């Protein structure tokens, strides 16, 4: 059976990067020749496995980390790369084996007037452990004062919307990322 690389790519909706999906792909034939031989995916360069040898290997567990991010902030989906998404929203392990892909989604994720659905963790008290997700709502404490209450000065909600307006440039355009991970 051909395992679902179709509702992790041609999905109606990818979730945000602060709460990213984890669809375990198992017990199939995973054909990556339909996945590499397509001009849509802009950022199908990858780590640990050469991309042309993916259909020659059998893996133990295959994941598929569906999310959508800003156009610039896609170099931060990389092993050892540090940034704001890479620190606080989605961290790859330094020994990452797998293949991250990405493509531009102005037709889908950027409606006229904006698409404020996709939000990212601007703040957290600590850097991420790799492959850790944190869906929290506690107000971040920045200054010396422990407010622990309403969002005051030096007291921020950690999330903030991307604001995917259709006029926005490819630096801010919604890039749709799937991060495969293997054994």
């Amino acid at each position: 059976n051909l395992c679902p690389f179709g509702e992790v790519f041609n999905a109606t909706r990818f979730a945000s990067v602060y709460a990213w999906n984890r669809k375990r792909i198992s017990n199939c034939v995973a054909d990556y020749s339909v996945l590499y031989n397509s001009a849509s995916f802009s950022t199908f360069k990858c780590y640990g496995v050469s991309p042309t040898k993916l259909n020659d290997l059998c893996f133990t567990n295959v994941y598929a980390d569906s999310f959508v991010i800003r156009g610039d902030e896609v170099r931060q989906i990389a092993p050892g790369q540090t940034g704001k998404i890479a620190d606080y929203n989605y961290k790859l392990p330094d020994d990452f084996t797998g293949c991250v892909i990405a493509w531009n989604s102005n037709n889908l994720d950027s409606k006229v007037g904006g698409n404020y659905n996709y939000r990212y963790r601007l703040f957290r008290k600590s850097n991420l452990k790799p492959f850790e997700r944190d869906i929290s709502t506690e107000i971040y404490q920045a200054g010396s004062k422990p407010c622990n209450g309403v969002e005051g000065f030096n007291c921020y909600f950690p999330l903030q919307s991307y604001g995917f307006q259709p006029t926005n440039g490819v630096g801010y355009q919604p890039y749709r990322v799937v991060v495969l991970s293997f054994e």
Partner: antibody
Amino acid sequence: EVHLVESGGGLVKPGGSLRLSCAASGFTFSNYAMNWVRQAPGKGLQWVSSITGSSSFIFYADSVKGRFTIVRDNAQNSLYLQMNSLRDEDTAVYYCARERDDYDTRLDWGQGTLVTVS
Amino acid sequence: PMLTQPPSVSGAPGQTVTISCVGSSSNIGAGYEVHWYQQLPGTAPKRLLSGNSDRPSGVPDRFSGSKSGTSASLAITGLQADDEADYYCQSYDSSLSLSAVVFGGGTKLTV
């Protein structure tokens, strides 16, 4: 008060080299994109090169593709453009331009430092 | 220029002149904002418009705008002597592996 000012443009022999810098103030340099764009005298504006805030998107015009390298420094508040191997048509006043989170085609401008090759 | 324009549209004071800017589907027809710039001779360009009426802070309100299909406009009604500069249209072109702001051909405006 958005401040883009350039430095480095001057008369070079054709086939020579240069490096126009572009200082920045009054905004977050690491957030917006950055453009290098020139105007030859008696000519309109021709787009030359663009870089973005993470510099993960670097693009060049077809006439200068493989000839130039736009380099930015996200912490120094400075944007550079490595000028190499100049042809005849690069006689222009080179402007520094920044995009904005609102539209990212909205551009601010620099006063322009001239480059002439002959 | 990847956009197009008439070479020079100009007229008498007290008139309206429509400075068009027509381009492809990727630059205007994909909904990107169309900006108009005032380049005085010997001066860096200074923007004066965005889409339909999004003027910047500190310009007279004669410069209105519009969008139509794969085109735009810079209808300036009732010109004065201060409106003597070259005018450039703009968009953003996100064709694959280009991702560039695009400028117009250049329209001179005299009184």
